[PDB]
Write a protein that binds this DNA or RNA. Structure first.
Ligand SMILES: Cc1cn([C@H]2C[C@H](O)[C@@H](COP(=O)(O)O)O2)c(=O)[nH]c1=O
Ligand SMILES: [Mg+2]
Ligand SMILES: [Mg+2]
Length: 683
DNA sequence: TGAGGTAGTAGGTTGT
DNA sequence: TACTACCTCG
DNA sequence: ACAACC
């Protein structure tokens, strides 16, 4: 490292727990009927809530900061239709030691419920769970935006309250769908009932009368809702054709008077105005302090003391094209890290002629600097020819074309997806560049160029340094359906001079089956074997999010058997809180060790962006020092080739894995058979 | 579809 | 998880 | 149901 510094977390030390709070009441829970296996925990949480006071689940029972006599000790629960009778039996009170982890966990849950409960009786603040919104940040015709904070409250091992505070905004609609449309506002993309929290997707807006509309049951829309007594205080307006978010293939009648639009930033782009909800970190730190003080004051918890942590500045990563670069885009001028002779094709959908002179010039320039030969083909064919177009594609692929650039006006989602999938089935990855295009838009088309090159299989940049792991692979799950795709991507070589993806697998949920984890890993090992002519001495395993229990067990045992060292790191995009400099400036490359095997990592930060959200990492397995892992992950973040001016927050293999399973989730996996693993089709 | 993150808005999974 | 808006271009 | 993540 090149310097240890000091930072604030967005945490605050408050008053010590009083001697009553350290000795909570213990209660035994008795349910009739006794719940089933899968009901016990939700029922325990529910009874902890029905009890009242400040009580939480403790093991099979309850812990409370309220004595039992001021609790609702007897009552009834409803759960999925079934009714349960409950009674709570006082079992004395037992001291909890903050020095001990589990007991501290109980004290912390109690603290959280404390925060919730005291927030509940504030006036007149908009409270939503653990969020509190005081000020009004912005208003408008039928809409307003509130400003406040998301909060949390737990217990330190020294026995004091720790308050986490992070400024937050909240968008609220005040008028119904009918009233909303009565202001010249366009149709919102989403909407919810007024009687419950269920939401819909708003499509058309029919003109059929609600008192003469055949509802799948006999009665009409209008008196169907009137029977439920929904439009008594309300008033049904027009007919709105909504659709289920999980079943959009079945339009449904509804009443504009019984709907309330759910407002997003693209429902307020009309007003434009300003609505910048990102905060400069100085302002966010200020708001954090102010809010922390307010909360500590109104809740009788004392004056906040901003907590401090020792941070370490990490070595600057050394990015390489043919020469050293500061950004991946500079490889276009200097040359790529590695380049074979390549053949790119051009597909024009704007009816215009061949290659734009400046794109051609830039490509020739970059390949000249790389000392590699270039072939610019032009696709003289159009998708509206039908299968003949596919024939054209096949001929292009046979002549050595590796990827094609598609110049087109903005395409609709479906047409974009369909075109890319089609090109994929003929083994051709595609880069789209939108066709109102001027040479002055160099960021857009240099990035398009970079993506194009990554898709042809080139490595535009690489890292220079000594790293513990010679192979780094990321795992993620993606897809917007009942099922998901679990996928892996990798950087092979200490330099990261080879980026590969592997064929994903369909899976029920977020957890990736052990066999699948291993198989993807074996594919990446095989990539390494094929490039280096040996097995890697050490691999860095990067999981997006939490690592489900034993998910990597089989793969880790397999690695052990082959004599390959490993590190498993959980990389969490949220839950890391915030970090602020005690000193002057806030820079990235920041490494903040907290617990053992778990640390924070500020990978990316631009001042014109808001406040950075540091990654939270847990070293789940392996014996590599935290500092080395942080070092390599931080540098790997700089290895991504398809973003020429801004580095991703995630290490390249995870970013890649993510875009891979996202794209497979969109297009489907059926198109990927003839696409080379070296070609990053999904960037 | 230019890319990135920070913001927001919906939704989900894992697991006690 | 995945969407859009904002702003700018290590 | 809630948790700490996606
Ligand atoms: C009763 C009924 C309602 N609906 C639609 C119209 C209602 O506005 C919408 C919402 O009803 P709900 O929220 O009470 O479940 O369901 C049908 O499509 N068919 C039916 O048979
Ligand atoms: Mg994920
Ligand atoms: Mg792309």
């Amino acid at each position: 490292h090149l310097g240890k510094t000091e930072v604030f977390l967005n945490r605050f030390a408050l008053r010590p727990l009083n001697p009553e709070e350290l000795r909570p009441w213990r209660l035994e829970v008795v349910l009739d009927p006794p719940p089933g296996r899968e009901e016990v925990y939700p029922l325990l949480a529910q009874v902890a809530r029905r009890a009242g006071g400040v009580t939480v689940r403790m093991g099979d029972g309850l812990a409370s900061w309220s004595p039992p006599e001021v609790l609702v000790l007897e009552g009834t629960l409803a759960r999925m239709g079934q009714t349960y009778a409950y009674r709570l039996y006082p079992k004395g009170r037992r001291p909890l030691d903050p020095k001990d982890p589990g007991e501290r966990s109980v004290l912390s849950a109690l603290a959280r419920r404390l925060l919730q409960e005291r927030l509940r009786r504030l006036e007149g603040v908009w409270v939503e769970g653990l969020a509190v919104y005081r000020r009004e940040h912005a208003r408008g015709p039928g809409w307003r935006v509130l400003g406040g904070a998301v909060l949390d409250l737990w217990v330190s091992d020294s026995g004091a309250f720790l308050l986490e505070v992070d400024p937050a905004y909240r968008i609220l609609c005040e008028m119904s769908l009918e009233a909303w449309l009565a202001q010249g506002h366009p149709l919102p993309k989403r909407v919810r009932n007024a009687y419950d929290r269920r939401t819909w997707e708003l499509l058309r807006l029919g003109e059929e009368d609600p008192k003469e509309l055949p509802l799948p049951g006999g009665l009409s829309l209008l008196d169907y809702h009137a029977s439920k007594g929904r439009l008594q205080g309300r008033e049904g307006g027009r007919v709105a054709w909504v659709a289920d978010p999980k079943d959009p293939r079945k339009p449904i009648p509804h009443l504009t008077g019984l709907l309330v639009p759910v407002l997003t930033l693209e429902d307020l782009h009309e007003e434009e105005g300003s609505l910048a909800l990102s905060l400069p970190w100085e302002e966010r730190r200020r708001r954090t302090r102010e809010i922390a003080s307010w909360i500590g004051r109104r809740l009788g918890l004392g004056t906040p003391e901003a907590v401090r942590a020792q941070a370490y500045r990490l070595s600057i990563p050394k990015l390489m094209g043919r020469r050293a670069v500061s950004k991946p885009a500079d490889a276009l001028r200097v040359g790529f890290y590695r380049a074979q002779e390549t053949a790119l094709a051009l597909l024009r959908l704007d009816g215009a002629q061949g290659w734009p002179e400046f794109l051609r010039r830039a490509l020739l320039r970059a390949f000249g600097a790389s000392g590699a030969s270039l072939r610019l083909h032009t696709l003289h064919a159009h998708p509206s020819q039908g299968l003949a177009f596919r024939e054209a594609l096949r001929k292009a692929k046979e002549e050595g074309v590796q990827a094609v650039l598609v110049l087109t006006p903005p395409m609709a989602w479906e047409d974009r997806n369909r075109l890319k999938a089609l090109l994929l089935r003929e083994g051709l990855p595609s880069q789209i560049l939108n066709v109102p295009l001027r040479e002055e838009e160099r960021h857009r088309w240099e990035n398009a160029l970079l993506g194009l090159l990554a898709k042809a299989g080139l490595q535009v940049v690489a890292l220079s340094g000594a790293y513990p792991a010679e192979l780094a692979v990321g795992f993620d799950a993606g897809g917007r359906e009942s099922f998901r795709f679990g996928g892996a991507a990798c950087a092979v070589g200490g330099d990261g001079g080879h980026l590969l993806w592997t064929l994903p697998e369909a899976q029920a949920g977020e957890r990736i089956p052990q066999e699948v984890v291993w198989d993807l890993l074996e594919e990446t090992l095989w990539a390494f074997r094929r490039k280096a002519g040996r097995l890697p001495s050490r691999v860095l395993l990067l999981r997006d999010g939490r690592v489900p229990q034993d998910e990597f067990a089989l793969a880790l045992e397999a690695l052990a058997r082959e004599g390959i060292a490993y590190d498993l790191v959980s990389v969490r995009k949220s839950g890391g809180g915030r970090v602020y400099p005690v000193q002057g400036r806030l820079a990235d490359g920041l490494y903040v060790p907290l617990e053992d095997k778990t640390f924070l990592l500020l990978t990316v930060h631009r001042d014109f962006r808001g406040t950075p959200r540091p990654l939270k990492l847990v070293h789940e397995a392996g014996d590599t020092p935290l500092e080395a892992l942080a070092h390599q992950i931080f540098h790997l973040t700089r290895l991504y080739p398809a973003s020429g001016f801004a580095f991703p927050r995630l290490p390249a293999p995870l970013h890649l894995a993510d875009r891979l399973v996202k794209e497979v989730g969109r297009l489907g996996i059926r198109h990927l058979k003839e696409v080379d693993r070296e070609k990053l089709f999904f960037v």
